[PDB]
Scaffold this active site. Structure first.
Site, PDB file in Angstrom:
ATOM      1  N   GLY A   1       1.228 -16.400 -12.361  1.00  0.00           N
ATOM      2  CA  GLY A   1       0.298 -15.289 -12.347  1.00  0.00           C
ATOM      3  C   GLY A   1       0.946 -13.922 -12.502  1.00  0.00           C
TER       4      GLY A   1
ATOM      5  N   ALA B   1      11.104 -24.930  -9.924  1.00  0.00           N
ATOM      6  CA  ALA B   1      10.537 -26.243  -9.665  1.00  0.00           C
ATOM      7  C   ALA B   1      11.252 -27.335 -10.490  1.00  0.00           C
TER       8      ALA B   1
ATOM      9  N   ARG C   1      -4.171  -7.624  -9.351  1.00  0.00           N
ATOM     10  CA  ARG C   1      -3.031  -7.147  -8.578  1.00  0.00           C
ATOM     11  C   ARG C   1      -2.353  -5.934  -9.215  1.00  0.00           C
TER      12      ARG C   1
ATOM     13  N   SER D   1       7.418 -25.048  -6.305  1.00  0.00           N
ATOM     14  CA  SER D   1       7.617 -23.616  -6.496  1.00  0.00           C
ATOM     15  C   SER D   1       7.243 -22.848  -5.221  1.00  0.00           C
TER      16      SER D   1
ATOM     17  N   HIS E   1      -3.922 -12.113  -2.585  1.00  0.00           N
ATOM     18  CA  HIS E   1      -4.243 -13.410  -3.220  1.00  0.00           C
ATOM     19  C   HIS E   1      -5.654 -13.890  -2.850  1.00  0.00           C
TER      20      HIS E   1
HETATM   21  O1  LIG Z   1      -1.568   7.587   3.983  1.00  0.00           O
HETATM   22  C1  LIG Z   1      -1.345   7.443   5.203  1.00  0.00           C
HETATM   23  O2  LIG Z   1      -2.222   7.152   6.042  1.00  0.00           O
HETATM   24  C2  LIG Z   1       0.069   7.647   5.733  1.00  0.00           C
HETATM   25  O3  LIG Z   1       0.021   8.703   6.666  1.00  0.00           O
HETATM   26  C3  LIG Z   1       1.301   9.118   7.092  1.00  0.00           C
HETATM   27  O4  LIG Z   1       1.217  10.206   8.036  1.00  0.00           O
HETATM   28  C4  LIG Z   1       0.829  11.433   7.458  1.00  0.00           C
HETATM   29  C5  LIG Z   1       0.797  11.645   6.064  1.00  0.00           C
HETATM   30  C6  LIG Z   1       0.413  12.877   5.534  1.00  0.00           C
HETATM   31  C7  LIG Z   1       0.073  13.915   6.410  1.00  0.00           C
HETATM   32  N1  LIG Z   1      -0.338  15.223   5.883  1.00  0.00           N
HETATM   33  O5  LIG Z   1      -0.616  16.075   6.727  1.00  0.00           O
HETATM   34  O6  LIG Z   1      -0.412  15.368   4.655  1.00  0.00           O
HETATM   35  C8  LIG Z   1       0.092  13.724   7.785  1.00  0.00           C
HETATM   36  C9  LIG Z   1       0.486  12.492   8.312  1.00  0.00           C
HETATM   37  C10 LIG Z   1       2.033   7.966   7.773  1.00  0.00           C
HETATM   38  O7  LIG Z   1       3.373   8.349   7.985  1.00  0.00           O
HETATM   39  C11 LIG Z   1       2.040   6.689   6.941  1.00  0.00           C
HETATM   40  O8  LIG Z   1       2.469   5.605   7.737  1.00  0.00           O
HETATM   41  C12 LIG Z   1       0.642   6.402   6.406  1.00  0.00           C
HETATM   42  O9  LIG Z   1       0.716   5.321   5.499  1.00  0.00           O
HETATM   43  C13 LIG Z   1      -0.270   4.291   5.698  1.00  0.00           C
HETATM   44  O10 LIG Z   1      -1.233   4.311   4.667  1.00  0.00           O
HETATM   45  C14 LIG Z   1      -0.650   4.221   3.377  1.00  0.00           C
HETATM   46  C15 LIG Z   1      -1.761   4.308   2.339  1.00  0.00           C
HETATM   47  O11 LIG Z   1      -2.629   3.213   2.517  1.00  0.00           O
HETATM   48  C16 LIG Z   1       0.171   2.928   3.223  1.00  0.00           C
HETATM   49  O12 LIG Z   1       0.912   2.964   2.019  1.00  0.00           O
HETATM   50  C17 LIG Z   1       0.339   2.037   1.063  1.00  0.00           C
HETATM   51  O13 LIG Z   1       0.714   0.701   1.351  1.00  0.00           O
HETATM   52  C18 LIG Z   1       2.122   0.532   1.329  1.00  0.00           C
HETATM   53  C19 LIG Z   1       2.465  -0.860   1.860  1.00  0.00           C
HETATM   54  O14 LIG Z   1       1.514  -1.643   2.149  1.00  0.00           O
HETATM   55  O15 LIG Z   1       3.684  -1.166   1.997  1.00  0.00           O
HETATM   56  C20 LIG Z   1       2.649   0.751  -0.092  1.00  0.00           C
HETATM   57  O16 LIG Z   1       2.107  -0.263  -0.939  1.00  0.00           O
HETATM   58  C21 LIG Z   1       3.032  -0.726  -1.948  1.00  0.00           C
HETATM   59  O17 LIG Z   1       3.984  -1.653  -1.440  1.00  0.00           O
HETATM   60  C22 LIG Z   1       3.396  -2.828  -0.881  1.00  0.00           C
HETATM   61  C23 LIG Z   1       4.504  -3.678  -0.267  1.00  0.00           C
HETATM   62  O18 LIG Z   1       5.444  -4.035  -1.264  1.00  0.00           O
HETATM   63  C24 LIG Z   1       2.565  -3.612  -1.909  1.00  0.00           C
HETATM   64  O19 LIG Z   1       1.842  -4.683  -1.298  1.00  0.00           O
HETATM   65  C25 LIG Z   1       2.476  -5.964  -1.507  1.00  0.00           C
HETATM   66  O20 LIG Z   1       2.282  -6.530  -2.790  1.00  0.00           O
HETATM   67  C26 LIG Z   1       3.110  -7.659  -2.969  1.00  0.00           C
HETATM   68  C27 LIG Z   1       2.982  -8.044  -4.442  1.00  0.00           C
HETATM   69  O21 LIG Z   1       1.882  -8.012  -5.040  1.00  0.00           O
HETATM   70  O22 LIG Z   1       4.049  -8.333  -5.023  1.00  0.00           O
HETATM   71  C28 LIG Z   1       2.825  -8.780  -1.963  1.00  0.00           C
HETATM   72  O23 LIG Z   1       3.860  -9.741  -2.026  1.00  0.00           O
HETATM   73  C29 LIG Z   1       3.471 -11.099  -1.802  1.00  0.00           C
HETATM   74  O24 LIG Z   1       2.933 -11.692  -2.975  1.00  0.00           O
HETATM   75  C30 LIG Z   1       3.767 -11.710  -4.142  1.00  0.00           C
HETATM   76  C31 LIG Z   1       3.011 -12.434  -5.250  1.00  0.00           C
HETATM   77  O25 LIG Z   1       2.646 -13.716  -4.754  1.00  0.00           O
HETATM   78  C32 LIG Z   1       5.103 -12.386  -3.837  1.00  0.00           C
HETATM   79  O26 LIG Z   1       5.994 -12.212  -4.910  1.00  0.00           O
HETATM   80  C33 LIG Z   1       5.733 -11.806  -2.554  1.00  0.00           C
HETATM   81  O27 LIG Z   1       6.853 -12.561  -2.181  1.00  0.00           O
HETATM   82  C34 LIG Z   1       4.722 -11.871  -1.404  1.00  0.00           C
HETATM   83  N2  LIG Z   1       5.378 -11.338  -0.192  1.00  0.00           N
HETATM   84  S1  LIG Z   1       4.825 -11.745   1.272  1.00  0.00           S
HETATM   85  O28 LIG Z   1       4.960 -13.157   1.456  1.00  0.00           O
HETATM   86  O29 LIG Z   1       5.611 -11.071   2.254  1.00  0.00           O
HETATM   87  O30 LIG Z   1       3.454 -11.305   1.320  1.00  0.00           O
HETATM   88  C35 LIG Z   1       2.790  -8.227  -0.540  1.00  0.00           C
HETATM   89  O31 LIG Z   1       2.307  -9.165   0.398  1.00  0.00           O
HETATM   90  C36 LIG Z   1       1.976  -6.942  -0.448  1.00  0.00           C
HETATM   91  O32 LIG Z   1       2.140  -6.398   0.848  1.00  0.00           O
HETATM   92  C37 LIG Z   1       1.565  -2.690  -2.596  1.00  0.00           C
HETATM   93  O33 LIG Z   1       0.930  -3.347  -3.674  1.00  0.00           O
HETATM   94  C38 LIG Z   1       2.255  -1.416  -3.074  1.00  0.00           C
HETATM   95  N3  LIG Z   1       1.237  -0.484  -3.582  1.00  0.00           N
HETATM   96  S2  LIG Z   1       1.679   0.590  -4.706  1.00  0.00           S
HETATM   97  O34 LIG Z   1       2.250  -0.096  -5.833  1.00  0.00           O
HETATM   98  O35 LIG Z   1       0.506   1.280  -5.123  1.00  0.00           O
HETATM   99  O36 LIG Z   1       2.695   1.415  -4.161  1.00  0.00           O
HETATM  100  C39 LIG Z   1       2.266   2.152  -0.595  1.00  0.00           C
HETATM  101  O37 LIG Z   1       3.059   3.140   0.034  1.00  0.00           O
HETATM  102  C40 LIG Z   1       0.787   2.416  -0.351  1.00  0.00           C
HETATM  103  O38 LIG Z   1       0.001   1.614  -1.287  1.00  0.00           O
HETATM  104  S3  LIG Z   1      -1.243   2.223  -1.927  1.00  0.00           S
HETATM  105  O39 LIG Z   1      -2.234   2.637  -0.908  1.00  0.00           O
HETATM  106  O40 LIG Z   1      -0.770   3.336  -2.772  1.00  0.00           O
HETATM  107  O41 LIG Z   1      -1.881   1.193  -2.766  1.00  0.00           O
HETATM  108  C41 LIG Z   1       1.141   2.702   4.376  1.00  0.00           C
HETATM  109  O42 LIG Z   1       1.651   1.386   4.347  1.00  0.00           O
HETATM  110  C42 LIG Z   1       0.422   2.937   5.697  1.00  0.00           C
HETATM  111  N4  LIG Z   1       1.400   2.890   6.794  1.00  0.00           N
HETATM  112  S4  LIG Z   1       0.981   2.230   8.198  1.00  0.00           S
HETATM  113  O43 LIG Z   1       2.098   2.317   9.082  1.00  0.00           O
HETATM  114  O44 LIG Z   1      -0.178   2.907   8.698  1.00  0.00           O
HETATM  115  O45 LIG Z   1       0.632   0.862   8.013  1.00  0.00           O
HETATM  116  N1  LIG Z   2       6.078 -18.219 -19.293  1.00  0.00           N
HETATM  117  C1  LIG Z   2       6.240 -19.105 -18.305  1.00  0.00           C
HETATM  118  N2  LIG Z   2       6.427 -20.407 -18.623  1.00  0.00           N
HETATM  119  C2  LIG Z   2       6.609 -21.287 -17.628  1.00  0.00           C
HETATM  120  N3  LIG Z   2       6.622 -21.079 -16.311  1.00  0.00           N
HETATM  121  C3  LIG Z   2       6.402 -19.782 -16.030  1.00  0.00           C
HETATM  122  C4  LIG Z   2       6.186 -18.765 -16.942  1.00  0.00           C
HETATM  123  N4  LIG Z   2       6.008 -17.551 -16.290  1.00  0.00           N
HETATM  124  C5  LIG Z   2       6.096 -17.860 -15.018  1.00  0.00           C
HETATM  125  N5  LIG Z   2       6.316 -19.196 -14.787  1.00  0.00           N
HETATM  126  C6  LIG Z   2       6.535 -19.824 -13.481  1.00  0.00           C
HETATM  127  O1  LIG Z   2       5.507 -19.435 -12.587  1.00  0.00           O
HETATM  128  C7  LIG Z   2       6.047 -19.371 -11.232  1.00  0.00           C
HETATM  129  C8  LIG Z   2       5.716 -18.034 -10.616  1.00  0.00           C
HETATM  130  O2  LIG Z   2       4.295 -17.907 -10.444  1.00  0.00           O
HETATM  131  P1  LIG Z   2       3.696 -16.583  -9.701  1.00  0.00           P
HETATM  132  O3  LIG Z   2       3.898 -15.377 -10.554  1.00  0.00           O
HETATM  133  O4  LIG Z   2       2.198 -16.883  -9.668  1.00  0.00           O
HETATM  134  O5  LIG Z   2       4.304 -16.608  -8.344  1.00  0.00           O
HETATM  135  C9  LIG Z   2       7.547 -19.627 -11.369  1.00  0.00           C
HETATM  136  O6  LIG Z   2       7.848 -20.987 -11.107  1.00  0.00           O
HETATM  137  P2  LIG Z   2       9.169 -21.421 -10.314  1.00  0.00           P
HETATM  138  O7  LIG Z   2       9.152 -20.831  -8.912  1.00  0.00           O
HETATM  139  O8  LIG Z   2       9.209 -22.907 -10.244  1.00  0.00           O
HETATM  140  O9  LIG Z   2      10.351 -20.905 -11.168  1.00  0.00           O
HETATM  141  C10 LIG Z   2       7.802 -19.269 -12.825  1.00  0.00           C
HETATM  142  O10 LIG Z   2       9.004 -19.846 -13.296  1.00  0.00           O
HETATM  143 NA    NA Z   3      13.326 -31.864 -12.212  1.00  0.00          NA
END
Ligand SMILES: O=C(O)[C@H]1O[C@@H](Oc2ccc([N+](=O)[O-])cc2)[C@H](O)[C@@H](O)[C@@H]1O[C@H]1O[C@H](CO)[C@@H](O[C@@H]2O[C@@H](C(=O)O)[C@@H](O[C@H]3O[C@H](CO)[C@@H](O[C@@H]4O[C@H](C(=O)O)[C@@H](O[C@H]5O[C@H](CO)[C@@H](O)[C@H](O)[C@H]5NS(=O)(=O)O)[C@H](O)[C@H]4O)[C@H](O)[C@H]3NS(=O)(=O)O)[C@H](O)[C@H]2OS(=O)(=O)O)[C@H](O)[C@H]1NS(=O)(=O)O
Ligand SMILES: Nc1ncnc2c1ncn2[C@@H]1O[C@H](COP(=O)(O)O)[C@@H](OP(=O)(O)O)[C@H]1O
Ligand code: NA
Ligand SMILES: OC[C@H]1O[C@H](O[C@H]2[C@H](O)[C@@H](O)[C@@H](O[C@H]3[C@H](O)[C@@H](O)[C@@H](O[C@H]4[C@H](O)[C@@H](O)[C@@H](O)O[C@@H]4CO)O[C@@H]3CO)O[C@@H]2CO)[C@H](O)[C@@H](O)[C@@H]1O
Ligand SMILES: [Cl-]
Ligand SMILES: [Cl-]
Ligand code: NA
Ligand code: NA
EC number: 2.8.2.-
Length: 670
Positions: free
Chosen positions: A402, A617, A443, A486, A453
């Site tokens: 994805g 995988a 996403r 995976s 998710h």
């Molecule tokens: O705004 C506020 O409220 C802020 O306030 C501050 O205080 C003050 C500010 C200003 C002032 N002023 O006077 O002006 C006074 C006071 C305070 O200090 C802050 O704490 C406060 O911030 C809070 O709110 C903000 C806004 O909502 C938060 O920031 C947002 O969220 C952040 C975050 O969540 O970390 C951050 O988002 C970015 O980063 C994230 C983490 O990487 C991303 O989310 C992740 O996405 C992953 C993914 O898709 O890859 C996902 O991963 C999982 O799935 C994938 C795919 O399957 C796998 O590869 C991974 O392995 C798997 N990992 S897992 O197993 O561990 O899950 C993750 O799970 C998921 O969390 C996010 O997409 C990304 N967004 S961005 O790209 O847009 O940047 C950003 O800073 C911000 O996001 S956004 O709102 O812009 O969208 C802040 O967290 C919050 N702080 S808190 O302490 O209150 O909680």
């Molecule tokens: N073009 C492609 N052809 C085959 N497998 C692919 C691919 N792009 C991604 N994948 C496989 O999709 C998985 C990741 O999926 P996701 O982005 O949803 O997490 C990985 O598997 P593996 O972990 O076995 O390497 C990755 O190798």
């Molecule tokens: Na194999």
């Protein structure tokens, strides 16, 4: 499975008390205890538990089930000295040979015979055709001609096969699993005769093993159809009975499917040498077999020496006559699919709720593992108006490729105004021309705004609110063994997705409903064994769960219904939701995925998709038995993916053919 003990499974219609006696002698002689058990549905349970570290050391069943077990790596190859092999008949060893290897010990040859009460009917009928007249005579005496089990296809098969029905065609040294013979003219004639017997009230569609046996043993019906094991209770009831050749149909013999009772050794057993000792030197001896036979008769035993002793028994002689007129069962894995298909077909035709033709056409499809789809199923044509109110929603199931596909959606589509993906920035702005409105829910565009998710249940309940339209849902699917591995590897390196909401019926699950599989902050370092061992692992059947309407099964509360209810509901819901999506792809078919997306939505990508074979995988070295256990943990996904793959590939072929024809027409014009 404990070391230094033997656990044996055998069906409840067999001589299990006799086998237990053989076990007691082995124990006397060796100090090794032998426990005989007869669990219900042992033949379905075995591949569910043997795939793990559990199950019996030895499993008994007719040989037709063992090819499937062997293909799954669940059986030890058996290694009998040539001396021992010569003690049994060679055609019985053939029954237990799979892909060149011996996978069980043959025990006895079973075939159905006609059994009749000599006090009601001193000469049994030679033809099925005379049974209605005979029944009319007997009904005037308050009796019936014939009762036998109509619920198990084993018992009706001899009549269905008589005039031409077959399971799988044998041609060129193998069974052709696409050439199925359950709906040909002979099969229909046979089943029609049986259905007519019931319509004319000579038999009852509800009759099962128990009902038929009770009637015969109480002198209420003049005949039954049954195997050697049945003779014991008849003797117990003191009926004066004979065992003879099955009646002919259209002048041809009834052709029963012939089973060989066989004993397999569990590949996961720590007692393989002991099981070997028991089977060769205790059971397969004149004395061992006599013990079993005296309990429930075995039929024609595989051991030459004891077969010769019993050959004079006319019941066994009739058994051999019927066996010679029938066919030995294939042992191939597709046998269970054949039997399941015919079982259902016979029940529905017998009941009168479906005609013979329709029911057997259904069995034909099921036995051949085919999927029929409508034109409407294959045609997905979306006039996708990016300037309108149309929205594509990408439901991303973990580990299905994805990230790659979602990147294609935001980086790689040729549009007048494509998504704006700023450097060093995760998300992109995917707005309609001139507006601040997004055309893509995903996403990498809108983010995880309905939860990390978010699955079908979450998205369909959240997306319309968080955006206010035509919503076009899309997804990707991956073969479940690869997808599961995976996920294991990703969890092993730190993934939890612990912040997912898992919302259903307006709330998240309770801890009781969805217990966590790990202590601490993650499950990093987990072995595949421990991964597979947690009952609440969301990796199990993830694609079905994430595509189904979870409200239909009480969300995450497993106490709301039984598994036998929940499972078919989940699979049907996932299939339906998937089928009715605008589009889906398969990870293993990147180029076809690209092509179908393009033609569905009338869009084109900038760069071609590419296939990556060397995945994490793919790099896992997987024993067959462990692959089998992963399939069993993901059995709903396995079924979904079989369905999805076939539909996807039929969609590809349909669209390509149409497009090629269109090109040709344009050329024909010019
Ligand atoms: O705004 C506020 O409220 C802020 O306030 C501050 O205080 C003050 C500010 C200003 C002032 N002023 O006077 O002006 C006074 C006071 C305070 O200090 C802050 O704490 C406060 O911030 C809070 O709110 C903000 C806004 O909502 C938060 O920031 C947002 O969220 C952040 C975050 O969540 O970390 C951050 O988002 C970015 O980063 C994230 C983490 O990487 C991303 O989310 C992740 O996405 C992953 C993914 O898709 O890859 C996902 O991963 C999982 O799935 C994938 C795919 O399957 C796998 O590869 C991974 O392995 C798997 N990992 S897992 O197993 O561990 O899950 C993750 O799970 C998921 O969390 C996010 O997409 C990304 N967004 S961005 O790209 O847009 O940047 C950003 O800073 C911000 O996001 S956004 O709102 O812009 O969208 C802040 O967290 C919050 N702080 S808190 O302490 O209150 O909680
Ligand atoms: N073009 C492609 N052809 C085959 N497998 C692919 C691919 N792009 C991604 N994948 C496989 O999709 C998985 C990741 O999926 P996701 O982005 O949803 O997490 C990985 O598997 P593996 O972990 O076995 O390497 C990755 O190798
Ligand atoms: Na194999
Ligand atoms: O969910 C529906 C039913 O499914 C299960 O029954 C299945 C079996 O799992 C399949 O293997 C198959 O059964 C065949 C069987 O393999 C074949 O050997 C023969 O069985 C004979 C047996 O040889 C003989 O020794 C004696 O025991 O009688 C048996 C017949 O009763 O024929 C079987 C088919 O009739 O297909 C059946 C489906 O019909 C599950 O166990 C059922 O309880 C369940 O209802
Ligand atoms: Cl986000
Ligand atoms: Cl492809
Ligand atoms: Na942001
Ligand atoms: Na941990």
């Amino acid at each position: 499975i404990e070391e230094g003990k033997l656990v044996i499974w055998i069906n409840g219609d067999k001589g299990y008390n006799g086998l237990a006696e053989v076990g007691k002698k082995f124990e006397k002689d060796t100090g090794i205890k032998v426990t005989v058990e007869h669990p219900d549905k042992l033949e379905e349970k075995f591949p569910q538990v043997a795939a793990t570290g559990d199950g019996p050391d030895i499993i008994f069943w007719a040989h037709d089930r063992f090819g499937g077990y062997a293909q799954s790596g669940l059986l030890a190859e058996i290694t009998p000295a040539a001396a021992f092999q010569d003690k049994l008949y060679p055609f019985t060893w053939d029954a237990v040979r799979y892909n060149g290897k011996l996978i069980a010990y043959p025990i006895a040859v079973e075939a159905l015979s006609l059994i009749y009460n000599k006090d009601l009917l001193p000469n049994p009928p030679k033809t099925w055709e005379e049974i209605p007249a005979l029944d009319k005579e007997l009904k005037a005496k308050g009796k019936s001609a014939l009762m036998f089990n109509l619920q198990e296809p084993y018992f009706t098969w001899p009549l269905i096969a008589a005039d031409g029905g077959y399971a799988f065609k044998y041609a060129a040294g193998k069974y052709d699993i696409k050439d199925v013979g359950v709906d040909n003219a002979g099969a229909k004639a046979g089943l029609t005769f049986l259905v007519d017997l019931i319509k004319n009230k000579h038999m009852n569609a509800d009759t099962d093993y128990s009902i038929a046996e009770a009637a015969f043993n109480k002198g209420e019906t003049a005949m039954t159809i049954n195997g050697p094991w049945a003779w014991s209770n008849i003797d117990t009831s003191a009926v004066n009975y004979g065992v003879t050749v099955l009646p002919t149909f259209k002048g041809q013999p009834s052709k029963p499917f012939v089973g060989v009772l066989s004993a397999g050794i569990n590949a996961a057993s720590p007692n393989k040498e002991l099981a070997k000792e028991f089977l060769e030197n205790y059971l397969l001896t004149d004395e061992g077999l006599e013990a079993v036979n005296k309990d429930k008769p075995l039929g024609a035993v595989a051991l030459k020496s004891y077969e010769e002793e019993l050959a004079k028994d006319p019941r066994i002689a009739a058994t051999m006559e019927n066996a010679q007129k029938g066919e030995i069962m294939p042992n191939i894995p597709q046998m269970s699919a054949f039997w399941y298909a015919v079982r259902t077909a016979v029940i529905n035709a017998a009941s009168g709720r479906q005609t013979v033709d329709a029911a057997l056409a259904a069995a034909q499809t099921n036995a051949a593992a085919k999927f029929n789809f409508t034109e409407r199923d294959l045609t997905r044509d979306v006039d996708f108006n990016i300037k309108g109110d149309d929205v594509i929603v990408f439901l991303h199931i973990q580990k299905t490729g994805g990230t790659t596909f979602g990147r294609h959606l935001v980086r790689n589509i040729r549009l007048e105004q494509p998504c704006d993906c700023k450097a060093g920035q995760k998300k992109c702005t995917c707005h309609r021309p001139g507006k601040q409105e997004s055309w893509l829910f995903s996403r990498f565009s809108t983010g995880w705004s309905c939860g990390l998710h978010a699955d079908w249940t979450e998205l369909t309940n959240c997306v319309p609110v968080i955006m206010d339209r035509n919503f076009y849902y899309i997804t990707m699917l991956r073969d479940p063994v690869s997808r599961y591995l995976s996920e294991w590897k990703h969890v092993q390196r730190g993934a939890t997705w612990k912040t997912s909401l898992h919302m259903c019926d307006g709330r998240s699950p309770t801890q009781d409903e969805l217990p966590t599989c790990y202590n601490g902050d993650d499950w990093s370092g987990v072995t595949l064994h421990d991964f597979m061992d947690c009952p609440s692992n969301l990796a199990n059947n993830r694609q079905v769960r994430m595509l189904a309407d979870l409200s239909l099964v009480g969300c995450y509360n497993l106490s709301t219904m039984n598994e036998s209810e929940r499972n078919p509901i989940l699979l049907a819901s996932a299939k339906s939701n998937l089928k009715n999506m605008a589009f889906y792809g398969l990870t293993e078919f990147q180029r076809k995925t690209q092509y179908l997306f393009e033609r569905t939505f009338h869009l084109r990508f900038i760069s071609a998709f590419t296939q990556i074979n060397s995945t994490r995988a793919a790099n896992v070295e997987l024993r067959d038995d462990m692959r089998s256990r992963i399939e069993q943990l993901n059995m709903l996904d396995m079924q979904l993916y079989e369905f999805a793959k076939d539909l996807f590939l039929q969609r590809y072929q349909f669209v390509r053919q149409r497009e090629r024809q269109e090109e040709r027409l344009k050329r024909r014009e010019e």
